[PDB]
Amino acid sequence: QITDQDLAKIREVAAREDLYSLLARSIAPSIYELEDVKKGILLQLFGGTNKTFTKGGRYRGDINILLCGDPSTSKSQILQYVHKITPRGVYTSGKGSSAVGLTAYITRLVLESGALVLSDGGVCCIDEFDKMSDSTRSVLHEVMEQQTISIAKAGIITTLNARSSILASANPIGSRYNPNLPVTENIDLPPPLLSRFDLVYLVLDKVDEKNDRELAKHLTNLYLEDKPDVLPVEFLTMYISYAKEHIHPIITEAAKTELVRAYVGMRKMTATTRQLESMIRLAEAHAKMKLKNVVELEDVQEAVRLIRSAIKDYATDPKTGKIDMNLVQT
Amino acid sequence: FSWTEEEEREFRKISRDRGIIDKIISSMAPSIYGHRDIKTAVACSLFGGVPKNVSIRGDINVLLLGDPGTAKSQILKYVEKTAHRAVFATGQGASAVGLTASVRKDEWTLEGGALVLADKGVCLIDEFDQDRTSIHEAMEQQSISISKAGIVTTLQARCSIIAAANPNGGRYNSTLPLAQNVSLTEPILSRFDILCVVRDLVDEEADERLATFVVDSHVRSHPENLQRQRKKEEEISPIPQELLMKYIHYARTKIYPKLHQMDMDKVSRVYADLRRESISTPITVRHLESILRIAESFAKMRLSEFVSSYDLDRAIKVVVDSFVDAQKVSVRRQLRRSFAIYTLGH
Amino acid sequence: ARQMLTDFDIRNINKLSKKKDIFDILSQSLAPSIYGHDHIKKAILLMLMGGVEKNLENGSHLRGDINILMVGDPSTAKSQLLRFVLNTASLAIATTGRGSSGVGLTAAVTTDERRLEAGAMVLADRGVVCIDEFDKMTDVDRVAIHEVMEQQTVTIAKAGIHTTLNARCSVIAAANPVFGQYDVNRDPHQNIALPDSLLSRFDLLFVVTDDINEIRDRSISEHVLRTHRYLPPGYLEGEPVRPKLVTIPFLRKYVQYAKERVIPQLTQEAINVIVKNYTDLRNDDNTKKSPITARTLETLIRLATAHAKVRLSKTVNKVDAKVAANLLRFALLGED
Amino acid sequence: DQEVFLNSLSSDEINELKEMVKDEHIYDKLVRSIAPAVFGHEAVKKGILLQMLGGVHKSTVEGIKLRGDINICVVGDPSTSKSQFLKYVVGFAPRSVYTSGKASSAAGLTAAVVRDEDYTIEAGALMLADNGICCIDEFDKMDISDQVAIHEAMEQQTISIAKAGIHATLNARTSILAAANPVGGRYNRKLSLRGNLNMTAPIMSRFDLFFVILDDCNEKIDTELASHIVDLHMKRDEAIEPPFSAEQLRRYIKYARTFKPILTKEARSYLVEKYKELRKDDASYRITVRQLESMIRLSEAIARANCVDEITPSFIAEAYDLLRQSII
Amino acid sequence: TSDVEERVMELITSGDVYNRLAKSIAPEIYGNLDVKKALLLLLVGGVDKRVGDGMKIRGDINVCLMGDPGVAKSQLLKAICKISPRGVYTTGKGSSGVGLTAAVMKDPVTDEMILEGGALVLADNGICCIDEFDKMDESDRTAIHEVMEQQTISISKAGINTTLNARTSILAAANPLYGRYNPRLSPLDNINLPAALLSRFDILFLMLDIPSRDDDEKLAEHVTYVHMHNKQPDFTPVEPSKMREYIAYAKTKRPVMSEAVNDYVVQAYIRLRQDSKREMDSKFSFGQATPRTLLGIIRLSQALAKLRLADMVDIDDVEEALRLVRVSKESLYQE
Amino acid sequence: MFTEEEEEEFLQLSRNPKLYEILTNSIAPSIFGNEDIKKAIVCLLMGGSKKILPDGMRLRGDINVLLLAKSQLLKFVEKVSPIAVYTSGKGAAGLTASVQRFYLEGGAMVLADGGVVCIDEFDKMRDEDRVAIHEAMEQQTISIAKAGITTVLNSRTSVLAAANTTILSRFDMIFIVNEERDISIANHVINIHTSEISIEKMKRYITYCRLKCAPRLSPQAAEKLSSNFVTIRKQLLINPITIRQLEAIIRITESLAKLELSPIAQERHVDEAIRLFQAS
DNA sequence: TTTTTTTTTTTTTTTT
Ligand SMILES: Nc1ncnc2c1ncn2[C@@H]1O[C@H](COP(=O)(O)OP(=O)(O)NP(=O)(O)O)[C@@H](O)[C@H]1O
Ligand SMILES: Nc1ncnc2c1ncn2[C@@H]1O[C@H](COP(=O)(O)OP(=O)(O)NP(=O)(O)O)[C@@H](O)[C@H]1O
Ligand SMILES: [Mg+2]
Ligand SMILES: [Mg+2]
Ligand SMILES: [Mg+2]
Ligand SMILES: [Mg+2]
Ligand SMILES: [Mg+2]
């Protein structure tokens, strides 16, 4: 529980100008660069706001993320960091799982929770998602969209509460990313599921000797001692857990003009209706992280920018859906 | 259900060469338009042939294919209400155990399934694999066998079967032979005493004539509407539906018709003629016994123990055209050009 | 079945083993009803003697057992000659390629808490397995055979069961080429669908063929027609039943005595002939029926050890190595 | 029956209903009032309403039953609120039940054989909801062994148990509201509805209404739609503004279910012609005789929506129109 | 213990222990010294490394032998299985990815399911020999990516939701596509492993069976001796129980890096990725080099620093670790 | 089971010099023509002779035949044989042997024993497909190594086939192919509804031969057959027939002698054997 | 001393 001295530290930190980079570099200290990947997985921990309409449905801050990319790029290791940091959760793989064991099991007649139901109110980490069977992927559609599961089997016919943000790690159809194929044909998830995620990343192992001079000079640097600025994790998890319950950002009218204008500017070019619903939930998470009770233009700009950067949309050609490898990090 | 002392006299009275058969064929599922050909068959399958012993079946089995929304599904549901005993087994809704027989404690025992609750009357079934293979055994002589709980035994069926099919996982099709529209082995199709196929031929002035009939039945069936029921039978059958559950039964169960051998030479002359042009681009003793069963059936239909030549003409009509559908797109015109003096050249 | 030997039979085996061409006496006495495939029947005799299995003190195994594949035209006694080996080995398990799935061929897990069930290759654990129509196996089945033929243990890792089982059998197998008939105007790797990793496991690969030739076809036809005139000794004309050659129960006793009571050691005099053959067989450029791997050196060492067993010899000599080299060059290159 | 309901209401409950029965625009207000969170798709909304009002389920002098239920399938490209309808309807209708087409079984959807102190029959979704709405989400992902469990029991009604020795049968008078994606995950405008959706054609033939949805690209729509979605998140249930509240609306629906509408001879004379037009316009695959009976059903439901005892050719024009639109 | 030290001190002071140990792996098999010199590193392993920042990196080394048939791939896997203190054997066709990893057993009693460790669980702090890795189904082969890099296993089936600690080393063996290596195709078309799987191997020895009038005489002169006697032909090895007594000592030494060595292995990784950028020309391509391969040089160099019983890695151990990665590929290029 | 009051009639059949044709005339007698077809059914009812050689080799005594309303012959065969089985592969049990849940099933080949199995579109039969018939029909044997099942299944039986490539290897001989018939046949059906030997004699005669006689080729029949088989191969060479066919000829030649109850076969039998074979 | 679905994961053979 937060004391008056702990709240004073939290309020000191939130006044810093480096804050969004400070938190991002502090959720996973030993990972090099990947700044836009950390900057979005930070927002998944806070999540959006959560809202009940007396009639007209229920809506929620559970941001879903897909780390898609070529091997040896720390997809699985960022997934280890998040699973340690999340106040509750699961880590699993796309081969280790079954549809039943991912959701719920008819036992004895009684129901037992599978992985997602064991993991509401925190991140569910799925690794190797590309190696998962289409039958197991076909169970995720409602539980990502409606935060719930419905069962109709022997005896048991029921729903379950299942409020889980998924973090998924995947690898493209040809096991290293293929620049001759378009981006949608690399990822190769069915569009009704690909459209379900809020952020989609390409991580790419682009060779660049002026970068790899730093990565190897970082990575081998761990081995200079046997047991070898950032926040202490003890305090970071506390700042996140304060902001998850003592802050609830509402949309300002000045933010609506931008949220609509941006959606129209994207949908002209596909940017289906879920892009707007994800921009809302990210723009809430950014204000929430910064301890504001109001969402503003400065937040909606980052919720847009981060979506454009994650898919390397600035490097994707405006037609064909292929990518120019020269433009990626310049 | 069954008829009585007044109705006995009434039956041989209403029995008339003024179309008592016809008023019956007209009366199968009166609230389905057109498709008299299917009505012709369902009448025969209700009335049945007569079984003869040493191995000859009396039962008249039928299969209804078609291009959907065509009231093949609902004409079966009419028979459950019209046959004396008859059992309706939704083709997906059954275990093969549920068609066959099952075992339970009382001490230990067995009890029967859908093909055992069938006995001279009609089994009603749909939706054409070990389930399916049970019909492949039941077709030959109308008896199951089992070896469950060490009880090596037969069980009798001796029943007709009415069967409905959606072909192809889709539409029926004129291209390819009938044999190919359904996942059915030819022995099945030989032992069915008739196969019928129905198409959506989209003639505008046929469609007009459905709709007049259909909506009127919606009026006639409205709860807004005992004695006005008597006007609301509305002559949609010429024979009160009330009587057919008696007429059928009284044919079946007073008449066991028999064949006037003097004229049966024409049946043989015809059977050779039919085999000759079937072979000119395949027809069998199972297609001859069908003529013989159905002809006994129609004498049942005009309440007569002694089969008469017009039954054979009606029977020949029913069996001949059913062959015309195999191969149809290539063959049919060739067949018609020969066949026309037989089927309806009266 | 098991024979019991006696002090009379053991005299006759020892005095017979002295004979100048004993390998030709015995190889003619296998399946004499089958004509003229003399070089195939010679290799079968060596397959029944096996070789010598060595296990080093560090646990390292060296295989001791001949494997034969014969591939050919239809109607060639290629099948019929397996159906004979099956009735003259001490322990033999019959099978066919389509009659097989790779699990039923090797080992299969069963729900009983779960067990492992012994398949056809785990049976015959010191005997022979006969495979007919070997080519009609799927490659998904033929991968099961790859484990056994060199390592001689099946191993499983399915449903929480993990184990090795011994599987020290010889395989004799028969096949058609891809084109039904053998296309002698085309390369062997195009007539034979099997991968080099499997053809490297068979010690001897006998391409056998029908070829139309008046004296050949006559002599064969006369052979079979003589055969179809046989009489069981107590029977009579038209009554239904119910240069030396040994009688086959004696042959089986000979195989059992040799397989029990001699374990030949290589002389260096034999090693020089084994080495001279392996190096020139592998380095000369003439097209082979399959590629010459370092498994082929072991084939020579085993065939010479198996012939020394036929000869009841405590040492493998130049004579055994010379018969092994001539038999191997007949199989891998072509007739001499 | 209407008398039992009108005895059940109080005078002050009736005095609210009295005015919305009096109003002229009422049918266009009812359609505007369904699922208020969903924008556009008035045709869909209108569909759902006519489902809740049902038809005159009736049987002929011939004992055959002619179905009164209405089966709606909503097919669509993703992110178009096809699910929002199902979740609205389960959260509204009497005897509703929701069900995913993937996480469900041939037992759990219909009749289940189970056991307790010997075998016994337990209810699946089509039993826990006769005289109500059985949603089916994700119906394209349903097992092909189990899509046929529904085919059994919509044209022929009548769940038919022939298994586990308990030979038994159940009425199950019920109305299906089934969402699906087209195969491959977006609508292939160039294909037939068959093969846009992989289903069994007989199962497809006996649905009344297929609303195919397309994500219409029109900028004047998406500038409005986006503003509508942001308003829901900005000011929640103050942003939704229906003509009637749900508890006011259910009293109207429950009242309207108590009329049993009747055909005028004009209405007959009109219906035969609207069948001719439909059939001529397929010169087969989606205009069988079933589409006639559906058109009757729908016209009865519209007449119920209007609280009229008789079918006016106006309503048949209105019903026929929904069938035309379904073609896209 | 000091009596163990009174034995291994005789070996250490006799000297040249790295070459003696490598030659002592399977003295039954002729040549392949470069490959024995790698499988020995797979016994000592690199160093497993937890970071105070909460990350952990692998200390197990993975090695692939890819080659022509009849070259003692399998005869050599079965040797490391006997030499290591905890190794297990398994094959491609005889193995499910399930029973290889771990499995959910349905009805042992009472119809309630339970979790049983597969071969990779038995190989806890030990070795799994995956023989004929080529003939494994891709759905089964893709089950090991999870264990070759990140150490752990995870299962979520039928009410069981579990991790298994499952720390282990992989020694795979395989034949190229089409049964033997084909020079007409690329190294990758021959190898026929997907790139994320290829990434998990700290070395891929491409060993080949090229004929030679001299080299096949030298082989047969060895192999015929090992049939004429159980002895190796001609040097004296160390017996397995004395080898284990050395390796289990060496495994305790955790050799740290040093800065002038870090600065050198960095330059070697740039040169390898620059080569990967330019040499995508199919006849020469081994795929792209990656951070898992930088850690490959670190692990292979730490393994050499254990075998010499060092306090820290030195540059003499990096120029040797880079050699094994090189010679593996050069076994093709030398033809 | 036979005794002195019965078998002397079988000695009288055995004496008559037109015996073979008396059998053709009494096989599916309703079916006109088809002479070499009915002749093949006879030879399949008679068989050659089983032999076990001193080197343990076994020689197959059973004939097999391929045919191309003739369904009545195969139906008639499941009447006349001492033992017989009729099926196309309608089964849906497999024809050969097939695996189920694991456990086995014996197919029609396994179920027939001595005697006969007969099969009508052997073409369209693919119910445990052609690969399983190569073992079953050639070897008298079906073999299985599937799902931990190991067994040999005997299959010591004749096969008659009809049809319409590979299985022309396994079939020993090959054959192919009015309206007044149909009028008589229909009149038989109507009359249910409203030389001259027969099954009663002929089945009992066939089993008596089968038990009491198993011929050998005279040396002069071997001279004829060997010289013929190479004369065939010399023409085949200059323009395949192989030992697989030569053995079939021999089996035929035995069954043709077996009809007489003769202890030995002669040129008399060889000449109708090689003549029937030339009707390939 | 004898069986029926329906839910589940892992194995094995059978069919497009
Ligand atoms: N000729 C007709 N006269 C009257 N109603 C008809 C006619 N043809 C079809 N129908 C109607 O269309 C539907 C036929 O349904 P049904 O009998 O179930 O069609 P079906 O094609 O046989 N169905 P199914 O076997 O399941 O594919 C019913 O609603 C009938 O009332
Ligand atoms: N000495 C022989 N030489 C050649 N063929 C023989 C000999 N003795 C018997 N045969 C006959 O020819 C066949 C021998 O070939 P066999 O081994 O049975 O067939 P196969 O060659 O495997 N042909 P196939 O099974 O069709 O691929 C037997 O069926 C016998 O009829
Ligand atoms: Mg990873
Ligand atoms: Mg129907
Ligand atoms: Mg053969
Ligand atoms: Mg949805
Ligand atoms: Mg190997």
Numbering used by the authors:
A (entry chain 4): 500 to 607, 614 to 733, 740 to 780, 792 to 852
B (entry chain 2): 474 to 527, 532 to 583, 588 to 609, 614 to 710, 745 to 800, 804 to 868
C (entry chain 3): 338 to 449, 454 to 583, 648 to 741
D (entry chain 6): 500 to 616, 620 to 785, 792 to 836
E (entry chain 7): 394 to 627, 630 to 730
F (entry chain 5): 348 to 415, 421 to 443, 446 to 455, 462 to 524, 544 to 556, 561 to 577, 592 to 636, 647 to 687
The authors write:
We observe two major conformations for the MCM C tier (termed conformations 1 and 2) where the whole C tier swings beneath the N tier, with some inter-subunit motion between adjacent C tier AAA+ domains. Despite the presence of the FPC and Ctf4 in our structure, we observe two C tier configurations similar to two conformational states previously determined at lower resolution for isolated Drosophila CMG in the presence of ATP (Eickhoff et al., 2019) (conformations 1 and 2). These two states were reported to represent CMG translocation intermediates, enabling CMG-ssDNA contacts made during translocation to be inferred from our structures. Conformations 1 and 2 differ in ATPase site occupancy and ssDNA engagement by the presensor 1 (PS1) hairpin and helix 2 (H2)/helix 2 insertion (H2I) loop that protrude into the MCM central channel. In both conformations, MCM subunits contact backbone phosphates using four highly conserved residues; every other phosphate is coordinated by both a PS1 lysine and the backbone amide of an H2I valine/isoleucine from a single MCM, whereas each remaining phosphate is bound by an H2 serine and PS1 alanine from two neighboring subunits. In Mcm3, the equivalent basic residue is absent whereas an arginine (R455) replaces the aromatic/hydrophobic residue. These contacts are similar between the two conformations, except Mcm7 is disengaged in conformation 1, Mcm2 differs in its contacts in conformation 2 as the path of ssDNA diverges toward the 5ʹ end, and the position of Mcm3/5 near the 5ʹ end and Mcm2/6 nearer the 3ʹ end in conformation 1 is reversed in conformation 2. The equivalent Mcm4 basic/hydrophobic pair is disengaged from DNA in both conformations, with a unique tyrosine (Y604) instead contacting DNA in conformation 2. Notably, conformation 2 represents the first example of ssDNA engagement across all six MCM subunits of CMG, as well as the first time a conformation with DNA bound across Mcm47 has been observed outside Drosophila.
The eukaryotic replisome, organized around the Cdc45-MCM-GINS (CMG) helicase, orchestrates chromosome replication. MCM is a two-tiered ring composed of six related subunits (Mcm2–7), with one tier of amino-terminal domains (N tier) and a second tier of carboxy-terminal AAA+ domains that power ATP-dependent DNA unwinding (C tier). CMG travels in an N tier-first orientation (Douglas et al., 2018, Georgescu et al., 2017), unwinding DNA by translocating 3ʹ→5ʹ along the leading-strand template, which is threaded through the central channel of MCM while the lagging-strand template is excluded (Fu et al., 2011). Multiple factors associate directly with CMG, including Ctf4 and the heterotrimeric fork protection complex (Csm3/Tof1 and Mrc1), which has important roles including aiding normal replication rates and stabilizing stalled forks.
